[PDB]
Design a binder for this molecule. Sequence first.
Ligand SMILES: [Zn+2]
Ligand SMILES: [Zn+2]
Ligand SMILES: [Zn+2]
Lengths: 160, 107
Amino acid sequence: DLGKKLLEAARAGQDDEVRILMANGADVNANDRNGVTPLHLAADKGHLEIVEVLLKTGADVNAIDIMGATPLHLAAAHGHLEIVEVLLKAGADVNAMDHKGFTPLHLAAWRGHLEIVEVLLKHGADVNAQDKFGKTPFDLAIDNGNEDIAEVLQKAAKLN
Amino acid sequence: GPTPLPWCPHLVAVCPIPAAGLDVTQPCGDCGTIQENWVCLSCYQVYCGRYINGHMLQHHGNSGHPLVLSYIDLSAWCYYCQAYVHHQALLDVKNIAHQNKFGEDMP
Ligand SMILES: [Zn+2]
Ligand SMILES: [Zn+2]
Ligand SMILES: [Zn+2]
């Protein structure tokens, strides 16, 4: 009953309701019927404070949804550098993979977030990982018109 | 299984192409996005991808429709099998979108 509300408080950025429902015993690791937790919703929509209170209260940092997306996949895709660093510091798997084969580095490169790419590479991101169709983060950067990220990923792969 | 599934126990749930055909440029029905969209092969609504707002995933969650076609690369995803799928049955609707999209057939 509370988990339903808490999920919505995270999406809507209600820093207040999150501290209400969660204080009344709302499951911090609550689920919807697609596996999305409050932490996924905070990371997706960029609520750094909600991410930090959910992690402090024991939110699974490496939780997953029906499609295998972790909070880090989401913060990396949507460009939330701050949340990315929080999640990584909290223990997020830098090379986690979704059911489509995408790592956070795939998404950050695809979406033109130069800053997150180097953070992920400094946390051990696999620059050679591949999706189901065999595309690297380099490949995705090229196809989507992000020349600068492609050059970084290329020099990181060439390091000898 | 293999990277593209050759068969899916949900292909039966694929519904015929509506007379209106497909519109690869159509926007998400709940946010209007024109960046990463999917089609519901059951009801042929259009909703954005996972990393836009998860509106096609929310659609699956409420309607139960298994299979969706991506207007980015015309791939077929099954939310239940949690994998890509390709089969003779899907092969037809992928030409309506491909004619629409590239003005040419699919090899
Ligand atoms: Zn949408
Ligand atoms: Zn549908
Ligand atoms: Zn299936």
